[PDB]
Design a protein around this ligand. Sequence first.
Ligand SMILES: OC[C@H]1O[C@H](O[C@H]2[C@@H](O)[C@H](O)[C@@H](CO)O[C@@H]2O)[C@@H](O)[C@@H](O)[C@@H]1O
Length: 101
Amino acid sequence: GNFSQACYNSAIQGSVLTSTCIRTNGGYNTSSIDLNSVIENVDGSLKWQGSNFIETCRNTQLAGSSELAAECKTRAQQFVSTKINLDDHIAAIDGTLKYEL
Ligand SMILES: OC[C@H]1O[C@H](O[C@H]2[C@@H](O)[C@H](O)[C@@H](CO)O[C@@H]2O)[C@@H](O)[C@@H](O)[C@@H]1O
């Protein structure tokens, strides 16, 4: 992971992370990744190893350089605040954001 060390000007809109990442040729590239493919809302908490959090969460934000923050519904249908460190699994490879397992 650790995209945040390779990238800057990052933003979250909905479930999409955008960022500008360094390229090996000396330049940079702007890219994006849909975090909804790789993050699950598990009883109100954002977790890896699943998908589709955006269906039952609201008010997504980037906190600091790498934290996804949101408000997500529990199984009992009430909202809690939750966060996950995108640096756990989101990497930058030659200027492009990629998920790494
Ligand atoms: O319904 C879509 C939802 O399914 C799964 O989440 C379950 C649970 O973890 C949630 O707390 C409640 C919230 O209503 O929904 C399900 O019971 C996950 O795959 C989740 O990412 C997805 O949004």
